[PDB]
Structure formats: C-alpha cells, structure tokens
C-alpha cells in the first residue's frame, strides 16, 4: 500500500495499556500463582504468551475470570514476566534468571527463553 | 533499573492484537458509525484515542457493548483510523485526508491530526 507509519505508535499503545494495568482499568482476569494474585488484560496476555493464547481461545476457559498456574511457578518470575509483557523491559538478574526462564518456558515466551539461555551460557 | 529491552516487543504485541481483531477474538465493543459497525477491543481504542479513553473510564459507559458515534463521522475515515490504531499504518490519500483529519480530531488522536495538517499545508 501507500500507507505512512508512526514509528512510536506501538510503544505508545503499550505504555497506555500499562497505565490501564497500573490503575486496574478494564482488567478482566486474575492470574493466581500460589499465594499471589496478578490482575491483567486477557488480550495483552494472549499477545505475549503462547500459553495464554491457547487458554483464552478455548471456548470454556475464555470465560473464566480466574486462572490458576501450575504450583511449581514462582510468583516473582511471573511478576517479572508480566512487567515485561506490558513494558518490553525484562528485569533479568543472576538471582532470578532460573525462575524467569522456567516461567517463560511454561508461558511459551520464546524470545525471553532465548535471552535467558544466552545469559546462562555466558556465565558457565 | 538494570533491565534489558526487546526492541520488537511492542510491535509484536500490536501485530497479535490486530490478529485477534481480524478473527474477532475477545472483541468487547461495537462502534456504530451511521450504517456501519466496527468490532474492537475497548483497551486498544482507549490506548489510541482521547475520546475512547474518556468514554470507557466513565463508570456507566465502561459497561456499554455498543457506542454510537456522532452522525457527522464518516465510516471510511473511522475505518482508516481503526486500522491505524491496530497497525501504526495510516492510509492517508488526497481523497480521504479531510474525512480522516475530521475523524482524528473527534477521536482525539493528536499525532494523526498533526500529519494531516502538515500534508494539507503542503498541497495549498
């Protein structure tokens, strides 16, 4: 086509979605990770995670307001990944890399899994 | 912080939101523009438009499944802008620039209004 493109549009949209998340506006699901609860937008979770994409396209699960993750999932790892989904920034640290990679594999977040594997390979 | 950032994340999220729109997955509102209807995600509309942000943060309107736009709004102008919201690409043409700018002013999409004013000023 003969379209023009606004370079910062996608980043501005995500920044606004994160602002809605921070003010708990139009969040439509709670993700339960052991004793912790995380409110989010189903659409953002699906856009970032192969697991959430599969969950919310299921004709029964699409209507659930609460999703319980596997008990092996670390709440901090999930929190770091939820922040990444809404910001593009990943808080990857020596102390959390194993939990973050395990959570990203479970959530099916291929690019996160890739950088974790590379950071781990560098430290061995 | 000491975060790393994935450059393409925001663009990939928006691409996936557009894929959900195309398959009508988790769309939660109909925007009525005269005889035409456009299905969308409230969160994406709020992230792109000052008007939708104001509408869906209203304690009564946040719960509406149908929003009727002012009858002066052109359905093609709205369609072009809805496509822009989900893709960052604006199909701006000599034949549609006036309708697109009028629709972007009504929707409160400042960057779109800005490029329309510049393209119009160049042709005078």
């Amino acid at each position: 086509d003969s379209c023009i493109q606004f370079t910062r549009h996608a980043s501005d949209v995500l920044l606004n979605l994160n602002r809605l998340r921070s003010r708990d506006i139009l969040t439509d699901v709670v993700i339960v990770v052991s004793r912790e609860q995380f409110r989010a937008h189903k659409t953002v979770l699906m856009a970032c995670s192969g697991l959430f994409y599969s969950i919310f396209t299921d004709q029964l699960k699409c209507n659930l307001s609460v999703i319980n993750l596997d008990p092996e999932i670390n709440p901090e790892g999930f929190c770091i990944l939820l922040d990444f989904m809404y910001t593009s920034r990943l808080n990857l640290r020596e102390g959390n890399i194993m939990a973050v990679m395990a959570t990203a594999m479970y959530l099916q977040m291929e690019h996160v899994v890739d950088t974790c594997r590379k950071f781990i390979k560098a430290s061995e | 912080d000491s975060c790393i950032q994935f450059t393409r994340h925001a663009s990939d999220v928006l691409l996936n939101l557009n894929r959900l729109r195309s398959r009508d997955i988790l769309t939660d509102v109909v925007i009525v523009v005269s005889r035409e209807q456009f299905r969308a995600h409230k969160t994406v509309l709020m992230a792109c438009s000052g008007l939708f942000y104001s509408i869906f943060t209203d304690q009564l309107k946040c719960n509406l499944s149908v929003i009727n736009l002012d009858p002066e709004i052109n359905p093609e102008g709205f369609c072009i802008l809805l496509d822009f919201m989900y893709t960052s690409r604006l199909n701006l043409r000599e034949g549609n620039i006036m309708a697109v700018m009028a629709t972007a002013m009504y929707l409160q999409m400042e960057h779109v209004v800005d490029t329309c004013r510049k393209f119009i000023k160049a042709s005078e």
């Binding site: 023009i4 493109q5 606004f6 | 604006l90």
Partner: peptide
C-alpha cells in the same frame, strides 16, 4: 512519520 515514515515511509514503511
């Protein structure tokens, strides 16, 4: 704005 750019030509994509």
């Amino acid at each position: 704005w750019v030509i994509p």
